[PDB]
Amino acid sequence: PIPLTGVPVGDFYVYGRMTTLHMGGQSGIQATTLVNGMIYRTDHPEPSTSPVSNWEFTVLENNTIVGAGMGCVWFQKSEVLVWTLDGQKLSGWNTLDGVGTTQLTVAWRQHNRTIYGWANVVAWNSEEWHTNPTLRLTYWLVKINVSSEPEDFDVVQKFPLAYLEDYTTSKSAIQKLNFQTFQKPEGGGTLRAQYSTVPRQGDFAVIWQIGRHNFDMSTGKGTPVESLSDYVMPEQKDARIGMWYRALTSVGPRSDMLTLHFHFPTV
Amino acid sequence: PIPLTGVPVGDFYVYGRMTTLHMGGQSGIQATTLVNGMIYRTDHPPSTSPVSNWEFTVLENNTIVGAGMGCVWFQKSEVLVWTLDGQKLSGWNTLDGVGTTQLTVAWRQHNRTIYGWANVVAWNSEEWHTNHQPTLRLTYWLVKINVSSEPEDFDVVQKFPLAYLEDYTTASKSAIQKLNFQTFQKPEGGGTLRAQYSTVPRQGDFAVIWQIGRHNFDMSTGKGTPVESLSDYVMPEQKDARIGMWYRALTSVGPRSDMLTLHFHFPTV
């Protein structure tokens, strides 16, 4: 047997149980199915000097927004395997304990307080899908610097789904070529973000954003996504990053064995 | 560097690119987003050999010991295979020459049910509580394809997973029901939807067929019960799954293919 020793050198895979941050719910009811709630707040009580994207997380370089975070899954370095490849041969069975982070920071807007310097970007990956900047799905591996306990709160939440036109609950006219993202309320015109579990300092999380934005795979920087709507995808897509179905699922469990591939800075 | 040597000994993990069989579509329009198309055909035929209400049917001896509602396929070369010892790599193996079981998958195409299409190799199942009725279970089988059949695109009733929406509005809001798992019909124009089979597997390749809904399964024999129908579901507790299949099996939309990881179990003694 090969023990999980060493630190991943170069691009590396991370496979293990990853837990969704908050569940789409309503006060009193345990939210168990709505896995992809994306908090979308345009109101900016943030001082103009300290900016934050229209979403929950905001990737920043030096006070400048270089990305956004709509979804968040988190894990612990003790529950995940890490391996790096030589083509398709195993070149490392390593652990994240002692991984190096970048200067890039992630800011977490929580209900009524935003935690600047919540995490430091470690590695990333991204992929585009042309819709006619084009639509991209970018995610970041981040190392968590602080330990915060978020507060459940009702907020408007956009979800991924299909473009239906004659909806019934048990048949609806489905549009192909079409990705749709829209808000979904329960009770108020918003939806409760039920933070079931929560990571801590030293843990790891994988935040991501999907939609029209630009990204640069060597610097880890890009642009935040402003808004989400309908998207017409003309041709097919055979993706390689390994998280499109998780980022497009409407309903799922809280956690599941998910695999991810991450790329280090290569300026 | 460690090479891909040997066949997986024991329960193994398969990571790689997995391409779906057919995309939910319509004549004229290329089907690029409808990734979770589950063909539901209650019309059964030639009655001499059984068939399930879905596209694929796992049969031990003409008994329907399972059913296949979704399908992703790949070739043995585009996957990583590794078995574990807790957290230490027991083997960096390949599917080349892996052993199959006597369980057989039959594929009901448009007007052609190809029997002995695949032989089951391994399996995994995960249940999620829903309330002599079976619990909701997700069961997928790793199968070794024995033919190179070229299927035929055709329009039928197609089951699709999604949330429970109530006051729908698009172009866009809909009262969303938490705790709720809805699986309904997704046709276009008429009453059915076309299955656009594009990249189709060949002999010697592998596929992952899975079923979701009310059914029972045995992780020791690989035999279970087929899923009759799909409706609404209420999941009072949360699920922290461990099979790595729920998000791909429950997404309403997604790319034709992507990288997935799956844990499989061999026959138990």
Numbering used by the authors:
A (entry chain B): 408 to 539, 546 to 582, 585 to 682
B (entry chain A): 408 to 452, 454 to 539, 544 to 583, 585 to 682
The authors write:
The HAstV capsid precursor protein comprises several domains, including a highly basic amino terminus that binds to the RNA genome, a core domain that forms the icosahedral shell, a spike domain that forms dimeric protrusions, and an acidic domain with unknown function at the carboxy terminus. The HAstV-VA1 spike forms a dimer and shares a core beta-barrel structure with other astrovirus capsid spikes but is otherwise strikingly different, suggesting that HAstV-VA1 may utilize a different cell receptor, and an infection competition assay supports this hypothesis. The HAstV-VA1 spike structural domain forms a homodimer, with each protomer encompassing residues 408–684. Also similar to other HAstV spikes, the structural domain of each protomer of the HAstV-VA1 spike comprises a core antiparallel beta-barrel, formed by beta-strands 1, 9, 10, 16, and 18.
We began by studying the capsid sequence from the first neuronal HAstV-VA1 (HAstV-VA1neuro) found to be associated with encephalitis in an immunocompromised patient who ultimately died after 71 days of hospitalization. In a different approach, we generated a larger construct encoding the C-terminal residues 394–758 of the HAstV-VA1neuro capsid protein (~43 kD), and expressed this protein in Sf9 insect cells. Despite low yields (micrograms per Liter), this recombinant protein was soluble, and limited proteolysis with trypsin resulted in a trypsin-resistant fragment of ~36 kD. Mass spectrometry analysis revealed a mass of 36,020 Daltons, similar to a predicted tryptic fragment of 35,970 Daltons that would be generated by cleavage after arginine 697. Thus, a new construct encoding the HAstV-VA1neuro capsid residues 394–697 (~36 kD) was generated as a fusion protein with superfolder GFP (sf-GFP) and expressed in insect cells with improved yields (milligrams per Liter). Statistical analyses confirm that there is a significant decrease in antibody binding to the HAstV-VA1neuro spike compared to the HAstV-VA1gastro spike. Thus, these data reveal that mutations present in the HAstV-VA1neuro spike protein result in reduced anti-HAstV-VA1gastro polyclonal antibody binding.
